[PDB]
């Protein structure tokens, strides 16, 4: 860690989405990048809100190093952050948990399989459970 000197820029307060949105410019000489979590900690001490109310993304590192430029959001509370931030960024921060899902094809196969049945399907099921005798 060598003097990352995080500077927020182009700041604008958005009360419609209950946040502040800004471009973050970080100078990190003698160092590869700066990680998003350490960015969030430093921005959390700059705007004094919490860590779980700040969000960063963007972050292309400049050619030749020494600089990366990204986008930040601090929120008005972590409640408002959990109601407006996208879920992929919440599970990236560890605020939500990645719901385990079947794959997209398997869901589509199951939906087309249920398209062929009319109603609950209990009568067809009991008919095959009877005709297991014959």
């Amino acid at each position: 860690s060598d003097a990352v000197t995080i500077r927020t820029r182009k700041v604008i307060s958005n009360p419609l989405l209950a946040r502040k949105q800004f471009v973050v410019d970080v100078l990190h000489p003698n160092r590869a990048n700066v990680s998003k979590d350490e960015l969030r900690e430093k921005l959390a001490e700059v705007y004094k809100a919490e860590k779980d109310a700040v969000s960063v993304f963007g972050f292309r590192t400049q050619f030749g190093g020494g600089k990366s430029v990204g986008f930040g959001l601090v929120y008005n509370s972590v409640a408002e952050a959990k109601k407006f931030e996208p879920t992929y960024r919440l599970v990236r921060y560890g605020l939500a948990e990645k719901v385990e899902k079947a794959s997209r094809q398997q869901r589509k196969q199951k939906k087309n399989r249920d398209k062929k049945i009319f109603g609950t399907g209990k009568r067809l099921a009991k008919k095959v459970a009877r005709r297991n005798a014959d």
């Binding site: 000489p29 003698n30 400049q62 050619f63 030749g64 190093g65 020494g66």
Partner: protein
């Protein structure tokens, strides 16, 4: 579908392939400026042809004409800004008299050589390409960079390199490793 990406071609080969005068001219240019193929010279003659075509289209227009004034001042301004066109010669007739050595003196390769950080155009080429050069505070490794004549004061070695300091490099650190190995 999405909007197509525009692209254009940036050079043009000459009409007669084998003519001894033009061959000896382009080899003199390539040797004096440290170029790798004839495509670079064709690129500059294409750019100069486009500039001359715009200036030819404006000089047919009469003077005091609003298009001629606007685009002549803009073209003259871009040429005096990149340093291809001198400060006194600013009259759109000197624009026509330009030639490819005026453009070739402004590349980062020959500027690094003229500032004297290089000792050759070929050393300048490899110094640029191997990232020991920084025109602002930003590394440039493109030899055809066309410095803009207030950037000439700021061409210097990169901070994150040897020759600008703070860590030697792979083969130096290896040789130091061998000599510290022999000491212990």
């Amino acid at each position: 579908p999405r909007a197509p990406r525009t692209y254009s071609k940036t050079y043009s080969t000459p009409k007669r392939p084998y003519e001894s005068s033009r061959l000896d001219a382009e080899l003199k240019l390539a040797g004096e400026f440290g170029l790798k193929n004839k495509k670079e010279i064709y690129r500059i003659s294409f750019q100069l042809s486009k500039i001359r075509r715009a200036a030819r289209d404006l000089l047919t227009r009469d003077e005091k004409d609003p298009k001629r004034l606007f685009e002549g001042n803009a073209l003259i301004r871009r040429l005096v800004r990149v340093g291809v066109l001198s400060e006194d010669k600013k009259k759109l007739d000197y624009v026509l008299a330009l030639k490819v050595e005026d453009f070739l003196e402004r590349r980062l390769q020959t500027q690094v050589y003229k500032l004297g950080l290089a000792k050759s155009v070929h050393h300048a080429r490899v110094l640029i390409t191997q990232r020991h050069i920084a025109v602002g505070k930003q590394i440039v490794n493109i030899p055809s960079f066309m410095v803009r004549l207030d950037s000439e004061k700021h061409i210097d070695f990169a901070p994150t390199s040897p020759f600008g300091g703070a860590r030697p490099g792979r083969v130096a650190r290896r040789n130091a490793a061998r000599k510290a190995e022999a000491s212990g």
